[PDB]
Amino acid sequence: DRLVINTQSFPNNYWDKFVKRKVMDKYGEFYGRDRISELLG
């Protein structure tokens, strides 16, 4: 799952993808905002 991090429809049957932006806001200001968001998408 180190290779599923960037994947597009990431919770394709789970819940919601807004959690990705949520944890970007948990962490991207600390380390890389545009780096880790692009690492997700």
Add this chain to the structure above:
Amino acid sequence: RTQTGNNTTVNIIISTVDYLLRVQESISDFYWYYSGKDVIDEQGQRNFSKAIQVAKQVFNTLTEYIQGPCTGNQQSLAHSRLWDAVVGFLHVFAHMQMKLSQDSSQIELLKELMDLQKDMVVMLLSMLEGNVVNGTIGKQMVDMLVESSNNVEMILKFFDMFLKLKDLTSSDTFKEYDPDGKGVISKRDFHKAMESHKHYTQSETEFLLSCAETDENETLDYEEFVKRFHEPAKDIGFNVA
């Protein structure tokens, strides 16, 4: 305390309480003198160290006055004055670390001063011990503390800074950050190392960078910047903790 057997008597513990009150007031005005110029000569330092030794000694007496759980000793101390003198001590320490955070001149007296804080709080916890439910004397101590809570902040967060930043300096923006890891890491090297950490305020980390003392070009030692007193400071903060 009591000296019951004679006709008349005294309570010598109250006498030493007021003596250290006078001592406290003297040291506080010494601070008030030095609080403006802040370029402190040899003389005031070396006599001040002797005054520090007095404070150390009288706290040693105080501790051994409550060496055991001697109760009426604690009762007199609960009704004693001394808490305000402690408050003024905290007030001294709060600004005192910051002026003493600079030079080779400073660090000796700073070491003695933080030593004195450690002994004072040792005195405090030693008289603390006899509590049961929440501690009436402990309630009194809460009154003293959260009364003087503001100057507690400076010393405690100073401890936090010096502790966590001797802790950070291992690696992963430090040891690999140069080849050797001696401390040829430059000033702004460490500054942006802190920025990449993004843990602390920029103000006090760059204040630490002001106390990095400019290792002849830009660099900064690992231990000799912080650790050599920070682990003493770790002991002290352990006591207060």
